[PDB]
From Swiss-Prot:
Top-level lineage group: Bacteria
GO-annotated cellular components: plasma membrane
Keyword tags: Bacterial flagellum biogenesis, Bacterial flagellum protein export, Cell membrane, Membrane, Protein transport, Transmembrane, Transmembrane helix, Transport
Keyword presence, Amino-acid biosynthesis: no
Name of the protein in its database record: Flagellar biosynthesis protein FlhA
Annotated family: Belongs to the FHIPEP (flagella/HR/invasion proteins export pore) family.
Keyword S-adenosyl-L-methionine (UniProt): no
Subcellular location per the Swiss-Prot or TrEMBL entry: Cell membrane
Function: Involved in the export of flagellum proteins.
């Protein structure tokens, strides 16, 4: 729709200039003319340096090194308007008043910085492409060539590894621990190339990391569990989790009512279930609550004190 305007506003008519309408850049940040001062950096303006910071932070927190960000002024947008696209899709838009501050007190460049970083985090799994996967594999190869060679390209293609990494990022599991990830892939890759299963084994191998992500030191972790009924009903539907519409809505609300209780009490809502069901529970809840962490018992370290506050029925 806005591409229609871009084409019509600009001169895009010939075969050669129409290609530019095809936006394939992994990350695009677009702004109206009012946001030129922050974008340029010869008239001050922090954007480039701010993006560098983001790339460093997220590399250390996620294990993902974001690609080059494409930066374009866009006349279709309002003076103060910015827009963020990832892999061709708009994921965020906003407005900044450069001479102002947002009330704790935040300057505009910081507002856009944390907005960009949060959006990249929400879509990180869309950004671990082949290029980034190869960069990580090549980096791993410098210190672990025997391990890498055991994994790839046989039994596992770069593409297979990419899907495991994307599935980890999707659920906010950092991919910094490349050694453990690849040792798990080496151990299972000959038994299966199924990226769904490879990721269940990898998540388990990453129990220490996942427990640190959710559990506090020597403190009991507040966790909703799943009924024996809910657990049997999902297992039955495995063929690809197909369940009749009435069952799904029922599990969805049990989850919804239980989750409310945790966030009513300033707590992060987590869900525990048994390993063979975990991946399917997640698939089911994805559209209803994308960012409800669904854990399996084998992803929490043995030493962790876990207690139910609600039981999903």
């Amino acid at each position: 729709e806005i591409l229609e305007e871009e084409a019509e506003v600009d001169e895009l008519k010939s075969p050669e200039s129409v290609v530019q309408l095809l936006h394939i850049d992994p990350i695009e940040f677009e702004f109206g003319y009012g946001l030129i001062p922050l974008a340029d950096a010869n008239q001050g303006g922090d954007l480039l340096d701010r993006i560098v910071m983001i790339r460093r932070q997220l590399a250390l927190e996620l294990g993902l090194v974001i690609p080059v960000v494409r930066i374009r002024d866009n006349i279709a947008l309002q003076p103060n308007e910015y827009r963020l696209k990832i892999k061709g899709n708009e994921v965020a838009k906003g407005e900044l008043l450069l001479d102002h501050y947002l009330a704790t007190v935040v300057d505009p460049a910081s507002v856009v910085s944390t907005h960009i970083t949060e959006k990249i985090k929400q879509h990180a799994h869309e950004l671990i492409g082949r290029q980034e996967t190869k960069q990580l594999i090549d980096h791993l190869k410098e210190s672990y060539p025997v391990l890498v060679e055991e994994v790839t390209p046989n039994p596992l293609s770069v593409g297979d590894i990419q899907k495991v990494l994307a599935k980890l990022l999707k659920e906010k599991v950092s991919i910094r621990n490349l050694v453990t990830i690849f040792e798990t892939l080496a151990d299972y890759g000959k038994l299966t190339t199924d990226s769904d299963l490879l990721t269940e084994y990898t998540r388990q191998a990453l129990a220490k990391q996942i427990t640190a992500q959710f559990a506090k030191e020597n403190e009991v972790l507040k966790v909703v569990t799943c009924s024996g009924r809910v657990e049997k009903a999902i297992a039955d539907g495995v063929q690809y989790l197909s369940l009749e519409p009435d069952i799904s809505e029922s599990i969805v609300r049990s989850v919804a009512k239980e989750a409310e209780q945790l966030s009513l009490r300033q707590e992060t809502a987590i869900l525990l279930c048994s390993p063979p069901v975990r991946m399917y529970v997640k698939q089911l809840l994805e559209r209803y609550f994308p960012d409800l962490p669904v854990l399996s018992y084998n992803e929490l370290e043995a030493n962790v004190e876990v207690q139910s506050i609600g039981v999903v029925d």
